Design a protein that fits this description.
Distance between the termini of chain A: 40 Å
Helix content of chain B: 10-25%
Number of strands of chain A: 13
CATH topology of the largest domain in chain A: Rossmann fold
CATH architecture of chain B: Alpha-Beta Complex
Family (chain B): Belongs to the phosphatidylethanolamine-binding protein family.
GO molecular function, one term (chain B): serine-type endopeptidase inhibitor activity
Number of domains of chain A: 2
Distance between the termini of chain B: 34 Å
Function (chain B): Specific and potent inhibitor of carboxypeptidase Y.
Oligomer: heterodimer
CATH class of the largest domain in chain A: Alpha Beta
Keywords (chain B): Acetylation, Cytoplasm, Protease inhibitor, Serine protease inhibitor
Shape of chain A: globular
Shape of chain B: globular
Number of domains of chain B: 1
CATH class of chain B: Alpha Beta
Bound molecules: 2-acetamido-2-deoxy-beta-D-glucopyranose
Structural class of chain A: alpha/beta
Largest interface: A-B, 42 and 32 residues
CATH superfamily of the largest domain in chain A: Alpha/Beta hydrolase fold, catalytic domain
Helix content of chain A: 25-40%
Order of helices and strands of chain A: EEEEHEEEHHEHEHHHHHHHHEHHEEEHH
Number of strands of chain B: 9
Structural class of chain B: mainly beta
Subunit structure (chain B): Monomer.
Largest sheet of chain B: 9 strands, antiparallel
Chain lengths: 421, 204
């Protein structure tokens, strides 16, 4: 069922829908929340937002990062003037099933490919229910962060292989994501040892330890890349994460923001709890039409499902090559203060990825990027044709949360500026 | 992504949330020494709590043991080492009715590994002895989902399976009393639990 959640604060005088879209022939109930552009919903593009985890709700991005309202300590919504629905209608989807308000009694997904099949179905049902967001020829984008670095490329491929789809895909955005493990795992040491724009956070003995185990880890990742099997990918995940991520984590430092200490829940940001409490209120659940009893930011079971299935180290980056070769614009952005999906690693796989214009791209010189809204030199860009890599200054794992204005400048210059920063 | 660093803690959390430490292992202090990767087919991996369609868990699955000297009385890998692989359902006929609690699905013994400390290895099936042949999930329609738990035990040095207590039959592992199985049997045979994985299956 679909509902009108306007009675809640969130975004007054902007139509929106919440509810479920079902694939009952598989017992899958996808919860979503839609917000129209605060400008012209008939002209402005549509954006699908996805958080990572894997197993975390997209409502996090809504209330905590880039949606129309955030939530105060008193559980009252506070309007966000820099919401991404300023010049685009946005869709927040809880996926895979059983994440957030999305649920499923029987089935369950363990890898990205399978999740891709499900999202494609959801989108078909969606644009079927709301032809208004396609009829007028609006562009449609898919944006997400973190582990969505796995989702997006695979997801985009899934939808582009269907010739009978009832909508189009204009471009995809990926912030601080994990996309090419083999390359990215090479930059945790330099990022944690004073070579990523921040003072070292690990004692020398540790940085060296990380260097020694690097080879073994990479070899294991390569092995997973070659066989794409549990036997090879799961061990690779265990060895590398313990060798390259564990040291940093043991210092109590925030894996999402190298300048902070991890404090609070399983996600290091105490405030996330506030939105969890807001979404669990009796009147909010009802107004939204939730069919699930208790809401949680992330579902750690599906998180472990992906882990123990070997999805973490798969070579999904190869999908990016296909997409780029087909001229699909792609924006890979990363805040330079994040650690677990740092900008060094993201610039690295982006500089060596093979594709028809990999030569002209590698040649391009990085230049300064001035945010339109703030007029500040907010980062360093590097782009050629339809491939762009953006380093965002003073941004952690969740860019919009640290630099909301510059973040809005980025998405708008992309969505409205012809996919070129 | 914060939770994907420590596979040990991740394992404990899963065992707790799904009552594997109390209903089956009977030890809330249990610490895994490694992780047990189990798979029926490339599309049917058992990944700590995922759901699998019954028909996919029809034949015997493949196993792999990854030891990581860090996730740690303590288990120190050696060459003489012989292992026992168990599969049990503590939700038989259901998560509530335990008339047959702990239904024995599989018990393989005298298994050896093909093979700062770290290694991933499969088992050498050759000289092993199956005390209880494999039988896939077959939960009663409507009983709800059942927990299918795989457990890897290290056998005491020098003692083969011909010396372990007999297993009358499957329901209750032939102990007669309800809610009894791997825990009871593993203790009276001095087996050392080393790892565990599990999945859910249901018949609607
Ligand atoms: C975004 O929408 C606002 C509507 O108030 C408009 O003033 C602004 O110029 C728009 N900019 C775009 C199209 O990026
Ligand atoms: C995608 O846009 C619509 C989908 O509603 C379709 O009719 C069109 O053919 C596609 N794009 C084009 C013009 O190739
Ligand atoms: C970026 O702008 C130019 C080159 O793009 C140059 O002044 C310098 O590299 C940067 N400017 C700043 C912020 O110092």
């Amino acid at each position: 069922k679909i509902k009108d959640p306007k009675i809640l604060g969130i975004d007054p005088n902007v139509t929106q829908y919440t509810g479920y879209l079902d694939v009952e022939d598989e017992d899958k109930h996808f919860f979503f929340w839609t917000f129209e552009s605060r400008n012209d919903p008939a002209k402005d593009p549509v954006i699908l937002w996805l958080n990572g985890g894997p197993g975390c709700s997209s409502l996090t991005g809504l209330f905590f990062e880039l949606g129309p309202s955030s939530i105060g300590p008193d559980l009252k919504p506070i309007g966000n003037p820099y919401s991404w629905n300023s010049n685009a209608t946005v869709i927040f989807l809880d996926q895979p099933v059983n994440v957030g308000f999305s649920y499923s009694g029987s089935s369950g997904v363990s890898n990205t490919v399978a999740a891709g099949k499900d999202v494609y179905n959801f989108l078909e049902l969606f644009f079927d229910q709301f032809p208004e967001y396609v009829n007028k020829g609006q562009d449609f984008h898919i944006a997400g962060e973190s582990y969505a670095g796995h989702y997006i490329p695979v997801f985009a491929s899934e939808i582009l292989s269907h010739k009978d789809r009832n909508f189009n895909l204009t471009s995809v955005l990926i912030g601080n994501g994990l996309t090419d493990p083999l390359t990215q795992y090479n930059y945790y040491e330099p990022m944690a040892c004073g070579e990523g724009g921040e003072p070292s956070v690990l004692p020398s003995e540790e940085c060296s330890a990380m260097e020694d185990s690097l080879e073994r880890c990479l070899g294991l990742i390569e092995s997973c890349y070659d066989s794409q099997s549990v036997w090879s990918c799961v061990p690779a995940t265990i060895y590398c994460n313990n060798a390259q991520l564990a040291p940093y984590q043991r210092t109590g430092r925030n894996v999402y923001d190298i300048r902070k200490d991890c404090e609070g829940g399983n996600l290091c940001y105490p405030t996330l709890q506030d939105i969890d409490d807001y979404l669990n209120q009796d009147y909010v659940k009802e107004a939204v039409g939730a069919e699930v009893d208790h809401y949680e930011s992330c579902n750690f079971d599906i998180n472990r499902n992906f882990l123990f299935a070997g999805d973490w180290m798969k070579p999904y980056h190869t999908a990016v090559t296909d997409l780029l070769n087909q001229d699909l614009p792609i924006l890979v952005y990363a805040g330079d203060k994040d650690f677990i999906c740092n900008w060094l690693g993201n610039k690295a796989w982006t500089d060596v990825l093979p594709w028809k214009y990999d030569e002209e791209f590698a040649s391009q010189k990085v230049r300064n990027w001035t945010a339109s809204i703030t007029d500040e030199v907010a980062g360093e860009v590097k782009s050629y044709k339809h491939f762009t890599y953006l380093r965002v200054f003073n941004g952690g794992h969740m860019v919009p949360f640290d630099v909301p204005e510059n973040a809005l400048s980025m998405v708008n210059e992309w969505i409205h500026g012809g996919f070129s920063l | 992504m914060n939770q994907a660093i420590d596979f040990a803690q991740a394992s404990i959390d899963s065992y707790k949330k799904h009552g594997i430490l109390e209903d089956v292992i009977h030890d809330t202090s249990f610490q895994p020494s490694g992780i047990l990767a189990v798979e029926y087919s490339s599309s049917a991996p058992v990944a700590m709590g995922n759901t699998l369609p019954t028909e996919k868990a029809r034949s015997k699955p493949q196993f792999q043991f990854t030891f990581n000297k860090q996730m740690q009385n303590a288990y120190v890998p050696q060459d003489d080492d012989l292992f026992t692989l168990v599969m049990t359902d503590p939700d038989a006929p259901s998560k509530t009715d335990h008339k047959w609690s702990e239904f024995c699905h599989l018990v393989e013994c005298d298994l050896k590994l093909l093979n700062t400390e770290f290694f991933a290895s499969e088992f050498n099936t050759k000289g092993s002895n199956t005390l209880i042949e494999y039988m896939g999930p077959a939960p009663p329609k409507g009983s709800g989902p059942h927990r299918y738990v795989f457990l890897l035990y290290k056998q005491p040095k020098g003692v083969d399976s011909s010396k372990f207590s007999k297993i009358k039959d499957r329901p209750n592992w032939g102990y007669g009393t309800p809610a009894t199985g791997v825990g009871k049997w593993a203790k009276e045979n001095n087996l050392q639990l080393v790892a565990s994985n599990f999945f859910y299956a249901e018949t609607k």
